């Protein structure tokens, strides 16, 4: 119920394979190259993680707490406000481990360092504890 959704059974194993389901598709494109396979699958991952966790606020269902979760986004309400629980940090280590493989692949370029890193800082800046209720100029 959006406070216990990433701490159920088998949500981690179905989150790793969703990256592989995204990567084996994007590696299977004719007019593309393998640097802009791992460049492309890093933007699509960190855009979904920023739109499904840091923009959508509320529940798809109707919470019987009279909408106490209405103003808070989905990151701010995992496991009822505690920060470093067992499954909140796994969603922070995972864009890092993807970033290292996209660092070994693409062979350490310039403008792909421009595009991969600022898409990697764009998912980690709101994941700090000292940026909990702040919404900067929007939403």
């Amino acid at each position: 119920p959006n406070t216990r959704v990433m701490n159920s059974r088998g949500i981690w194993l179905s989150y790793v394979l969703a990256i592989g389901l995204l990567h084996i598709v994007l590696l299977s494109i004719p007019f593309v190259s393998v640097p802009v396979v791992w460049t492309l699958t890093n933007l699509i991952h960190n855009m979904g993680m920023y739109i499904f966790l840091h923009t959508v606020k509320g529940t798809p269902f109707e919470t019987p707490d009279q909408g106490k979760a209405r103003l808070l986004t989905h990151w701010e309400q995992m496991d009822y406000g505690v920060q470093f629980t067992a499954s909140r940090k796994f969603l922070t280590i995972t864009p890092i481990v993807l970033y290292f493989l996209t660092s070994f692949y693409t062979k350490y370029d310039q403008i792909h360092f421009v595009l991969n890193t600022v898409s990697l800082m764009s998912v980690l800046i709101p994941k700090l504890p000292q940026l909990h209720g702040v919404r900067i100029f929007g939403i």
Partner: peptide, 28 residues
């Protein structure tokens, strides 16, 4: 191979960010 200028420095920050992140254990 093995040597960009201002990238392994930034990759060296995040690999030390994880070990801090793996040991925090608590909040409100």
């Amino acid at each position: 191979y093995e040597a960009p200028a201002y990238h392994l420095i930034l990759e060296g920050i995040l690999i030390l960010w994880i070990i801090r992140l793996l040991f925090s254990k608590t909040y409100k």
